[PDB]
Structure 1
Amino acid sequence: FMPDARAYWVTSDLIAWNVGELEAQSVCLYASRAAAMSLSGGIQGYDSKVELQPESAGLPETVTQKFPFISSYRAFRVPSSVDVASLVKCQLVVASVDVTGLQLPGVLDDMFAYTGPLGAVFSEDSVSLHLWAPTAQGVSVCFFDGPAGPALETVQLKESNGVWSVTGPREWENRYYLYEVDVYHPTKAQVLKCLAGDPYARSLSANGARTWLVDINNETLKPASWDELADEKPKLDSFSDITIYELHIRDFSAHDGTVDSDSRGGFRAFAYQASAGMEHLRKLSDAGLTHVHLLPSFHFAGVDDIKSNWKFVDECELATFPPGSDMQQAAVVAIQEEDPYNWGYNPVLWGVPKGSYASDPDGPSRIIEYRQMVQALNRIGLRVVMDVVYNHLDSSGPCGISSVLDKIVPGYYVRRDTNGQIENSAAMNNTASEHFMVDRLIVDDLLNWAVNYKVDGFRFDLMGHIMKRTMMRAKSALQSLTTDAHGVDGSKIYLYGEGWDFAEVARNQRGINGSQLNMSGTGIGSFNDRIRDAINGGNPFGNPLQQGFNTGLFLEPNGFYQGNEADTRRSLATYADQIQIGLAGNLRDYVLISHTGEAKKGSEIHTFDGLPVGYTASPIETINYVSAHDNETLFDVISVKTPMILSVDERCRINHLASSMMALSQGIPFFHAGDEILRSKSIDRDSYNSGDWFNKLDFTYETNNWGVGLPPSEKNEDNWPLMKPRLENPSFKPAKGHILAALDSFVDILKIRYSSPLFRLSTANDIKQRVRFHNTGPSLVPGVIVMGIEDARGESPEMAQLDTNFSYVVTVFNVCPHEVSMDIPALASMGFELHPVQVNSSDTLVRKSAYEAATGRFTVPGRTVSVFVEPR
């Protein structure tokens, strides 16, 4: 007997099931505590049976608002005679034959939503444990002395209102434990005794095998001066001042010879202030970088915390293989499930630092070293953003070390389809943030990282899979934290995420989800894929050779057929429109003279697919990027899409153009770690499991990791024929000189952004008043964007003076492979000069940029971004 689950128990007194009128006249509910039911004519082996009267009114508004996708279902009234608390612990089916199980989240929230303490609570004389498990038949705690010792004692918990609790003496502190949860698992149609960690865990033994009953407030877990960290944190006057650098903790130091051997790859590496890696971050910070976004750093699956199990390729041997060989990736893939490497998008327990990144995965090191990492980054002027992954779980079901949440309350923390099968669109085991205790756990976990680890912001992985209400409740709770009450200034904590809208959450089918369009007007950032794709060309899931504004479309065709010349010219101009909307903060309401000459709002310029290009209400809602850990690195995408015959010197200028478009954009610029040093993954489009070999970040600057073999076959083999000749071509590979020059130009473009408040305007109104584009319409000069930003000038101005040094800034982005002269008669007879940073540039070419007053002519060399300022 293995029923599906097509009916929903939505409230204490209502069941929803999509049956017909006649069928609805003979519906009954059947329960068996021992899960002993079977088919006979009817159901048999039940403890109890009760008729469900059809509720002719259907489902009430609260239900249909919470579960839109079942709003048309027939409703059935559960008699007041039923002991609901008892029944939800049983095997349940409804039947009319037609027999199916019940999806319980609605009734579980209706009856057992709980706001009291969860996890471990410490007092002077006691330790208490609290677990929400309203469907469990029994819960006990198993205690162990130590991460490896035998069970010492089992203690029964007692349930009240869905929550199991027990109180013990203070000496319980620092024991290890697991819960023994007896609960009905639908996937097995059996009541099983499951051994599970604490969802509210704050530390774990290796691999989360046991929960460590640690007091997170213990003084010995604090680095020196920890409680004073708020006072040492880098000033953040406005979210408009944010720039983001996205970095993986292992990539940072795995190859860094200036870090002690035993301390490479984890949290401790950040405590080496004089290391090549930390000096690099300090250089960026000094230039103006404000935030570092760290890839997943909580307890995820896919890397063993036990370092003695780690495997490694022979790096010396692999270095001997040809640059376009498939042998390097074969060697990497052979041990990719046993190496130290994963991006970490495989959540197990959200509230605990990843053990593999700690010096010792048992005991306190993971806590103190995480704190030391945050403190170290703050002390070089960088705020710390965590990549939080609340949209799915690594594992589900009653078995195995990697399943926790779904072991304890099966079928609740995970989203399910209308047959009761778990949804997998966000990798596997999608969560259901629409459910009250899931939403609670998400917000509680955010507050844990903000308060216990003094984390400065959060990037939400697949934010479109999270309910908007969860995002907003989190935002409010975070931003209300104060230094006086909580030790952190919550008003400075910044949130942003991936607002992709797809699969079962699209069309608001599970509620209003955290999509790009739905997050407009929330002050929560989202990744601007439109500017990304317009600059680079195509899309990460389209033909890799499709060119864009900054990869030669029309101007420098690459030989891939993309239409007639008129078609490519127009497609280039269309991409320019999309980029300019993005450069002006990707706003719904910003008015641009489009390539046809027609004035259009950002929302009226549409994606090749129908939706608004510009979708935000504020520049702080826009995360502008051309690169990230996903898909090809900036250097690799440029190497794929540009004409093969371009020199690496030319491509280095193109890299600078792309990162400069980000650095000089309104909104929040986002940089992939390595943008600044030409980082390559040898064209790996999805390097999550591609090891240190393909993910090398070389802070000696001797290499960029181009030409280290064809990348792993699973994600890349279809494109190997285009990759091979490029990887094999010595003319594609940059040398140290190119890498250092890329870093110098990146530092300078950051200095330019932070030289004028005009690049970082705080509101849509300011951008609409001040930001103008000057090369527009059908007769625009292809390959050039001219962006002016006005400040108060003359006597009696109609705007505030934002900039004490400059009254006007004009930026010309010239992607043409030749000098251009852009006449802007509107800007004639003004005091423009080349920006002092560029006058003093190590790049000889940008120094040649010039302004002629009589005509308003800005002369800009090929493949160059030139910034002109009018001094006060």
Structure 2
Amino acid sequence: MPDARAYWVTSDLIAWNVGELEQSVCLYASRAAAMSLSGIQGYDSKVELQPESAGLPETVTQKFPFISSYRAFRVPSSVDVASLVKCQLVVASFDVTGLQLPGVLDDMFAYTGPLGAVFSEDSVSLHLWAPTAQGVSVCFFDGPAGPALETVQLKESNGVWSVTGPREWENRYYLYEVDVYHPTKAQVLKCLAGDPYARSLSANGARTWLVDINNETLKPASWDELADEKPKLDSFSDITIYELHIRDFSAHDGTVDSDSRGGFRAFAYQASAGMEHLRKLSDAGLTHVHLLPSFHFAGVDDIKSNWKFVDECELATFPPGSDMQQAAVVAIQEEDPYNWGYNPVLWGVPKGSYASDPDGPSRIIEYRQMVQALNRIGLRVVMDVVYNHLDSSGPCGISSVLDKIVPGYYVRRDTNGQIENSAAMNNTASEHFMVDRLIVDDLLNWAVNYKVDGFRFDLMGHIMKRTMMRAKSALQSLTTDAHGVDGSKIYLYGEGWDFAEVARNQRGINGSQLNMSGTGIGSFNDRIRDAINGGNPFGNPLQQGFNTGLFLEPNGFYQGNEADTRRSLATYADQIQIGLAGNLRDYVLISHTGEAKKGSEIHTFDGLPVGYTASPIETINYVSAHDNETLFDVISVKTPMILSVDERCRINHLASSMMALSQGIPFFHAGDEILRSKSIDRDSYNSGDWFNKLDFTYETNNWGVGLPPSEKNEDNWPLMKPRLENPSFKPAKGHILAALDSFVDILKIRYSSPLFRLSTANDIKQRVRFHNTGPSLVPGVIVMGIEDARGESPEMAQLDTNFSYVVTVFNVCPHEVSMDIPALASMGFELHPVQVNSSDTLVRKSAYEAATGRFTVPGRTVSVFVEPRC
């Protein structure tokens, strides 16, 4: 983008950071974009701006904090602002620079009326917001491939272009022809653009399909009664999440027909191994499946005849630590069917590559059939929404839509006018009114038109808090009577990471972890993640954590002396325990020094509070996700090499059990339960089906299938190779099935007692106690007690009709421990019936001794004890 260091913030105010003396500022305009530097030449009009020593007003400095110190310049009322914003514009001092227009575009043209296509009994109308455009027409087509049918002009009213046609316009395909000034090219360009409000598209979004989303033929059988069939959700506190990629789910599933693998239709195969797997988890108590991006994204061709694949039989013959597998994958990675999909083009349309036919209605109906089928096996559906950036910007290319139409508006820019890229590329600006509008409108589209049950917000910290809250309110007020869905059950969460240009609320109060405290919107708890696994996404891969052998089982990487590692372990245990108690600001823990500390008073990187939430439903507790190494892989990297796979399997279980028995909302990565490996790939977004294999035959976990792709992994290839080559690292089917069995059981334990899912911070503060704390704590053990009403005259409600007390012991030590808790002596504790009947013979040996309150727990085991009310 070229130089644009001034801002047109309101109809009558311009902001520019020039010095006092620099009283001679003028605004130049050229409709045909013909200006040059002399003194400016080739302008239609020149107007002097009167300086404003009142400074920028409250509303401007609140909306754009980062420019709050800029000098304000008054635009004379003689200026025709509507005409000027359609021109090439510069201001000059006596230094020349362009103008960033979003402030004035919102001030004058913020619009709440219909956008996209509106269907009435006798007509179809199209509406497009494009206040800077000099002209807008619509080019129609009869079909996704054929020649032009006709072009119709749209007429502008207050920034919005519209036209109304007959009802027979329905099912045509179309594009907008938009004449608009593009700063990056310094020309008025005729751009061919899709509809931001599209509901369907031809292959690759080349054309927009003028479809009526309410048409009966787009509805699966019994679609309108899906609300009645949706699984009950009594509380957000009952949520558990399973994070799954649509292609991963069925790409390798032989029980699905070959022509129907990798997409929406695969979820209709109820008897498939994959759907039987999800049924098993759902039956054990899992409530939500979070699907990776499933809207129209770039990086996968919708046209299946262009898809390329590796020779799977050849690659199977290569050695487990060879670099040849990744070479073959990388050779086709730009042309294969695979991508996570974090490359947004149009948010409101199902991804064509996941449909049976990317032209016509299959993408709509099949998406609905997917939601319906998941709901029918007891699972609510969460969509991974990516509102923080766009795949592309500018006037050219199939993958640029929003920035084609209103350049420099939907995207966030720096103080020189260059597009911000911290999210990946082409960061959006939800701080702008129509971006905020599009985000909320899209969410309501998915909630109402596809009956989606929740949303995970990618880089929520890059979205304005006001956008998140307005969305939350709109979604949760939807009703079955008015909209066909119970909005009160719709749950929102996201990545509240706080970095780059949105840090320190520089663009407004953003959706960071700290800012979302007290909003009821979940965010990923990175503190528990890193405390359990060790290190961080950017640190040394060998840095150990609570569950990967820090102090207890050192791996040979130097991490201080024995006192240092013991202290680091205890510090991590503090952070874990705050997390296990819902990661609350106000929860009081006896810290490892002996000092009682609130969750907010225990600090992490940059002195920030470990516990930052106001409620447990604000905490998404996780140790694994699609990003970074899988749970199996991180454990395989960090633990001592000499551990057996049997031992590491127990360690995998410990990690997922800490999540499954935590207060707040547990989050599991698809494959946690079956030891899923990516052969240590840290960023597998483009590593294809080969490295992302989800094997529901349970014969393999995909460990030892070659070094992962060099671009993101080569620096760590030396640590990976000997591990991938070592046959003792690889689990067999027996291990995989045992991992699944123990995962199902811990879910069952979570849902066996309301005490694991307390709904408020007050409840957690009153009921949750940790019993192995302080400087003399027993290393490698966490003891978590949860109290219910007991005796006559209780100080709390009775939440659990079966149990009056629950105690969980997480023992990561490679030996049995005996934990004496005198305060829990002389009580009726016994092993949880699920564990009494476990297929794992070791956990059955767990015991309680009444006289001393001793809980005896085997090595590498989580033991749950309950006090029956009988």
Please confirm whether the aligned pair reaches a TM-score higher than 0.5, indicating the same fold.
Answer: yes
Contact 2:820–2:852 (CA under 8 A) maintained in structure 1 = yes
1:275-319 deviations in Å (ceiling 9; x for gaps): 000000000000000000000000000000000000000000001
- CA distances 1:692-721 after superposition (whole Å, capped 9, x unpaired): 000000000000000000000000000000
The residue that corresponds to 1:513 in the other structure is 510
Tell me whether 1:409 sits opposite 2:409 in the alignment. Answer: no
Residue of structure 1 equivalent to 2:26: 28
Give, in whole Å, the separation in 2 of the partners of 1:21 and 1:97. 11
Tell me if the contact between 1:256 and 1:276 (Cα under 8 Å) persists in the aligned partners.
Answer: yes
Q: Deviations over 1:50-103 (max 9, x none)?
A: 000101111000000000000000000000000000000000000016000000
Q: 2-side partners of 1:608 and 1:726: how far apart?
A: 31
SS in 2 for 1:441: helix
Flag structure 1 segments of 5+ consecutive residues without an equivalent.
Answer: none
Distance 1:853 1:862 in 2: 21
Q: Give the TM-score normalised by structure 1.
A: 0.99
3-state SS, counterpart of residue 636 of structure 2 = helix
Q: How far apart are the structure 2 equivalents of 1:55 and 1:143?
A: 49
Contact residue 9 and residue 106 of structure 1 kept, 8 A: yes
CA distance in 1, matches of 2:836, 2:498: 45
CA–CA distance in structure 1, aligned partners of residues 660 and 681 of structure 2:
25
Could you tell me the TM-score, scaled by structure 2's length?
1.00
Structure 1 residue 569 corresponds to structure 2 residue 547: no
Match of 2:861 among 859, 864, 871: 864
Q: CA deviation at 1:243?
A: 0.1
Residues in 2 aligned to 1:97 and 1:302: alpha-carbon distance in whole angstroms: 48
SS in 1 for 2:502: helix
Whether the 8 Å contact between 1:31 and 1:93 is mirrored in structure 2 is yes
| Structure 2 counterpart SS, 1:546 | coil
Residue 131 of structure 1 corresponds to which residue in structure 2?
128
SS of match in other structure, 1:609:
helix
Q: Is it true that 1:839 corresponds to 2:828 in the alignment? A: no
SS at match of 1:505: helix
1:120 match: secondary structure: strand
Mapped contact 2:300–2:339 kept (Cα < 8 A) = yes
What is the distance in 2 between the residues matched to 1:529 and 1:305? 35
Q: SS where residue 115 of structure 1 aligns?
A: coil
Offset, 1:609: 2.9
Q: Is the 2:25–2:94 Cα contact (8 Å) retained in structure 1?
A: no
Q: CA deviation at 1:225?
A: 0.1
Asked if 2 retains the 8 angstrom alpha-carbon contact of 1:588 and 1:612, the reply is: yes
Partner residue, 2:391 = 394
The Cα of 1:264 is off from its aligned counterpart by 0.1
**8 Å CA contact retained: 2:178, 2:191:** yes
For the residue of structure 1 that corresponds to 2:133, the secondary structure is: coil
SS in 1 for 2:791: coil
Q: CA deviation at 1:260?
A: 0.3
Cα contact 2:2–2:184 (8 A) shared by 1: no
Residues 6, 17 of structure 2: 8 Å contact kept: yes
Report the Cα distance in structure 2 between the residues aligned to 1:28 and 1:790, rounded to whole angstroms: 71
- Kindly state the Cα deviation for residue 382 of structure 1 after the two structures are TM-superposed: 0.1
Map of 2:437 onto structure 1: 440
Query: Which moves more between the two structures, 94-103 or 2-11?
Result: 2-11
CA contact (8 A) 1:663 1:753 kept: yes
**Secondary structure at 2:279 match in 1:** helix
Deviations 1:27-67 (A, max 9, x none): 00000000000111x00100000000101111000000000
Aligned-partner Cα distance in 2 for 1:56–1:34: 34
How far apart, in 2, do the equivalents of 1:183 and 1:383 lie? 43
> Out of 182, 189, 192, which is 1:192 matched to?
189
Q: Provide, for residues 784-820 of structure 1, a one-character-per-residue CA deviation record: whole Å limited to 9, x for no partner.
A: 0000000000011000000000000000000000000
Secondary structure of the residue that 2:751 maps to in structure 1? helix
Could you say what secondary structure the match of 2:749 adopts? helix
> Which secondary structure does the structure 2 equivalent of 1:3 belong to?
coil
SS of corresponding position for 2:606: coil
Pairs within 5 Å for 1:48-447: 48-96=45-93, 98-447=95-444
- Matches of 2:763 and 2:307 in 1, distance apart? 54
2:421–2:427 contact (8 Å) kept in structure 1? yes
For the 8 Å contact 2:494–2:524, the answer to whether it is kept is yes
In the TM superposition, residue 219 of structure 1 has moved relative to its aligned partner by: 0.2
Rounded Cα–Cα distance in structure 1 between residues aligned with 2:140 and 2:353: 24
Shift of 1:826: 0.2
Q: Give the Cα–Cα distance (whole angstroms) in 2 for the partners of residues 787 and 168 of structure 1.
A: 66
CA contact (8 A) 1:517 1:615 kept: yes
The 8 Å contact of residues 388 and 458 in structure 1, kept in 2 or not, is answered as: yes
Moved over 4 A (4+): none
Shift of 1:503: 0.1
Tell whether the 8 Å contact from 1:3 to 1:99 is kept in structure 2 after alignment.
Answer: no
Aligned to 1:17: 16
CA contact (8 A) 1:791 1:803 kept: yes
Q: Deviations over 1:101-122 (max 9, x none)?
A: 0000000000000000000000
Partners in 2 of 1:553 and 1:92 — Cα distance?
61
Q: CA deviation at 1:3?
A: 4.9
**Using the alignment, how far apart are the partners of 2:218 and 2:464 within structure 1?**
34
Contact 2:2 / 2:418 at 8 angstroms: preserved in 1? no
Deviation string, structure 1 residues 446-486 (Cα, Å, up to 9, x no partner): 00000000000000000000000000000000000000000
Tell me how far apart the structure 1 counterparts of residues 613 and 819 of structure 2 sit (CA, whole Å). 30
Tell me the secondary structure at the aligned position of residue 813 of structure 1.
Answer: strand
Q: Secondary structure at the match of 2:143?
A: coil
In structure 2, C-alpha distance between the alignment counterparts of 1:861 and 1:480, rounded to whole Å: 49
Contact 2:24 2:94 in 1 (8 A): no
Instruction: Give CA-to-partner distance per residue, 1:314-337, whole Å, 9 cap, x none.
Output: 000001110000000011001100
Contact 1:132–1:162 (8 Å) recurs in 2: yes
Whole-angstrom distance in 1 between the partners of 2:502 and 2:606: 18
What do the CA deviations read for 1:608-651 (whole angstroms, capped 9, x no partner)? 43100000000000000000000000000000000000000000
Q: CA deviation at 1:540?
A: 1.3
- The aligned length equals 869
**Matches of 1:3 and 1:714, distance apart in 2:** 31
Per-residue CA deviations over 1:505-554 (Å, capped at 9, x if unaligned) read: 00000000000000000000000000000000000110000000000000
Structure 2's unaligned 5+ residue stretches are none
CA gap of 1:3–1:327, structure 2 versus 1, over 3 A, is: closer
Percent identity reads 100
- Helix, strand or coil for the counterpart of 1:701? coil
Conserved 8 A contact 2:2-2:417: no
CA shift for structure 1 position 602: 0.2
Residue deviations 1:827-868 (CA, integer Å, cap 9, x gap)? 000000000000000000000000000000000000000000
